């Protein structure tokens, strides 16, 4: 290990999923650099929340294509986030768009009695996010540029 920008995201993007999955808000304390991770899971809440709904029609096209019933429908997953997400231009707009379909397949896991794929999600989008936006991600200060993006404060 070592990779604290990989550690953060894989904790705000591991929470968003679960709590989305499962309607629980859970409790631990946020390992280094919290203040920070709390502050991008509440934006994360706002502003994905806000994609889901106001993008569901889309959403649903898109989970319906891609079939999702196991951990090997969410290994072709990763394969398309790959083309679709790393291959497209780099943004918050974007990584926002990325974690909220996340979210989105999360509750769709859980309704079909799956849960045991949602930690497997979230790994599978932190690696998209870390390995293929390294450069950008500490370009705009990781998740710092994320509170600071949206001016929560
Ligand atoms: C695997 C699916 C992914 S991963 C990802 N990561 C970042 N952006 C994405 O889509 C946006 C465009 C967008 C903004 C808001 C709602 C839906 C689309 C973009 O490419 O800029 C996507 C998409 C995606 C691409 C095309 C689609 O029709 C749908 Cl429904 C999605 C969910």
């Given at each position: 290990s070592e990779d604290e920008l990989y550690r953060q995201s894989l904790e705000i993007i591991s929470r968003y999923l679960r709590e989305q999955?499962?309607?629980?808000?859970?409790?631990?304390?946020?390992?280094?650099?919290?203040?920070?991770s709390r502050k991008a899971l509440?934006?994360?809440?706002?502003?994905?929340?806000?994609?889901?709904?106001?993008?569901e029609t889309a959403f649903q096209?898109?989970?319906?294509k891609?079939?999702?019933?196991?951990?090997?429908?969410?290994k072709?997953?990763?394969?398309?986030?790959?083309?679709?997400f790393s291959?497209?231009?780099?943004?918050?707009?974007?990584?926002?768009?990325?974690?909220?379909?996340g979210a989105f397949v999360?509750?769709?896991?859980?309704?079909?009695?799956?849960?045991?794929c949602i930690e497997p999600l979230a790994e599978s989008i932190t690696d998209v996010l870390?390995?293929?936006?390294r450069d950008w991600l500490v370009k705009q200060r990781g998740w710092d540029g994320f509170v600071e993006f949206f001016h929560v404060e």
């Amino acid at each position: 290990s070592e990779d604290e920008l990989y550690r953060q995201s894989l904790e705000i993007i591991s929470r968003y999923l679960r709590e989305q999955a499962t309607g629980a808000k859970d409790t631990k304390p946020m390992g280094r650099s919290g203040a920070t991770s709390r502050k991008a899971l509440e934006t994360l809440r706002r502003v994905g929340d806000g994609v889901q709904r106001n993008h569901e029609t889309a959403f649903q096209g898109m989970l319906r294509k891609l079939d999702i019933k196991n951990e090997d429908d969410v290994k072709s997953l990763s394969r398309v986030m790959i083309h679709v997400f790393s291959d497209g231009v780099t943004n918050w707009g974007r990584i926002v768009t990325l974690i909220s379909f996340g979210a989105f397949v999360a509750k769709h896991l859980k309704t079909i009695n799956q849960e045991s794929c949602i930690e497997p999600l979230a790994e599978s989008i932190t690696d998209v996010l870390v390995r293929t936006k390294r450069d950008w991600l500490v370009k705009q200060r990781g998740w710092d540029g994320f509170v600071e993006f949206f001016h929560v404060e």
